[PDB]
Each structure stands twice: as C-alpha cells, then as structure tokens.
Write a protein that binds this ligand. Structure first.
Ligand SMILES: O=C1N=c2cc([N+](=O)[O-])c([N+](=O)[O-])cc2=NC1=O
Length: 257
C-alpha cells in the first residue's frame, strides 16, 4: 500500500465534519483528495492518505541542512509520494522528483474590495496603502532578488516599512487585508488568492496579472518506481479536461460569492 503524504490546506485536503464515524481515506475530502484517487486509478496502486507531521511543505534549514514538511518525509523515507499543492522548485527537485504540473499559479495581489490598486506598479507608486508578503519563503525572496525596476522598488519599500508589512502565516495576511479597511494589500499565490475570493464575506479580490509563473507538482523520491506513471497520469488527466473540472468544482461550484 502506497503511503501518501499530503497537507491540510483548503480546498486541497480537509476533514469531513463527521470524520470520527469514518476511517481510512474516507475521513478527507477536497481537490487533492479527488486527485489522489485519479492518480491511483491511472497508476494501478492502493494508497493510504496521511497528513504531514509538522504540517509543512518542504524547506531545507540553512544551518542544519535538514528537510522539513512533505519533502522531508520523502527524503527520510516516511512517505512514498506527495500529492498536494507543492510548488515545483529547484532546491526541492535536487532531492525529489516532480511530475509535470497539475495546476498553474503565480505571485498575485490581494486587495480588500474598493482598494484603488490594480497592479504591482500601482502599489510601487505610493505608500498610503501598505503591502507585504509572508516574512519568509518564495514570495519574499522574489522581491529581494528581483532586477525588475518595479519589483526592486517594491522590495526597498517593504524592507524598511513600519509597521512591518510581513506576516507569519498566509491566514494572517488574508485577515490583515480584510481588517485593514483597504490600507493593506497582500502578495500571495494566485490559487489561494482566487479561492479566498470565493469565500464569505466575499470582501477580497485578485487584481493585476501574476508577477511570475509557477506550478504544483506531485513528488516522489529519487529512483521511485512510481515516477513515470504519475507523470503520464497528470498529463492524461489534463488532456481529458479533468484537472480543470476538478478546480472549477472546488473553487467555483462550491464557491459562496
Ligand atoms: O510548496 C508550497 N506550496 C504552497 C501552497 C499554497 N496554497 O495556496 O495552497 C500556499 N498558500 O497558501 O499561500 C503557499 C505554498 N508555499 C509553498 O512553499
């Protein structure tokens, strides 16, 4: 039985309100829950869904060189495959294999409805409306290392802005936009930005185009016998229109706005 590590992030993987009554993979529902079943069918294997221990994605500590999150659980042999919204990145692909992307995304701007901002440039040309990112991770580094005039101007601003414009978690950034009366814009992944746009009280919105291009991939350890079939199944699913169907289902059909 294939051990599948995943993370509790809406609407990818959630607990059914009556999870105690059920057991097995029946306790969960969501985009990745459905995706897992499909990948399992097209690769001919049995699996058990497990929630990543530390509830993280996967980063390598700079001093200890230890991997945490789902990537960690793969390189340390505790899981056979990772099916979740795990961004495909260089540092992670050095230690594990990524399938072709099953969903596209990018850094985007979230604003409280009515906020007079329509693009990253709009943000860079003022200070009345503060804006920031997660105090650590991909999106922060993007601005810190960008050579682009507008992004570099945004970085210089965020660097020294007071009060600090960085948040410890994604939920904190979203709440900050909702409770700042339009004086705070949050920079986060487009997929999460658009999900939140479809949730009550429907006071947020995604504006402007993506600042970059990324993708979520399914991960397997190096040398995994699953690697090949997983890759083909993701392509077949997308070619048959199922991935787009799956996203519309969890983002829109189940939307509240
Ligand atoms: O691997 C990653 N996957 C993520 C997936 C999501 N998500 O949207 O599912 C978010 N987000 O919530 O901002 C951040 C993430 N950061 C990462 O490092």
């Amino acid at each position: 039985t294939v051990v599948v590590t995943t993370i509790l992030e809406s609407p990818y993987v959630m607990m059914k309100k009556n999870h105690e009554m059920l057991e097995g993979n029946e306790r969960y529902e969501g985009y990745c829950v459905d995706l897992a079943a499909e990948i399992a069918k097209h690769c001919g294997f049995k699996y058990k869904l497990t929630i990543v221990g530390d509830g993280k994605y996967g980063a390598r500590d700079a001093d200890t060189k230890i991997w945490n999150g789902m990537v960690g659980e793969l390189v340390y042999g505790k899981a056979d495959i990772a099916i979740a919204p795990l961004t495909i990145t260089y540092v992670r692909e050095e230690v594990i294999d990524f399938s072709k992307p099953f969903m596209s995304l990018g850094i985007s701007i979230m604003i409280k409805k009515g906020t007079p901002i329509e693009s990253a440039e709009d943000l860079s040309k003022q200070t009345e409306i503060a804006y920031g990112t997660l105090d650590s991770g991909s999106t922060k580094e993007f601005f810190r290392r960008s050579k682009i005039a507008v992004f570099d101007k945004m970085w210089t601003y965020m660097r020294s802005a007071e009060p600090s414009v960085f948040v410890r978690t994604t939920a904190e950034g979203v709440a900050r936009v909702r409770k700042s009366k339009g004086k705070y814009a949050y920079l986060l992944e487009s997929t999460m930005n658009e999900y939140i746009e479809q949730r009550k009280p429907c006071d947020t919105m995604k504006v402007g185009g993506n600042l970059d291009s990324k993708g979520y991939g399914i991960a397997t350890p190096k040398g995994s016998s699953l690697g090949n079939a997983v890759n083909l199944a993701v392509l077949k699913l997308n070619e048959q229109g199922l991935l787009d169907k799956l996203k519309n289902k969890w983002w829109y059909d189940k939307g509240e706005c």
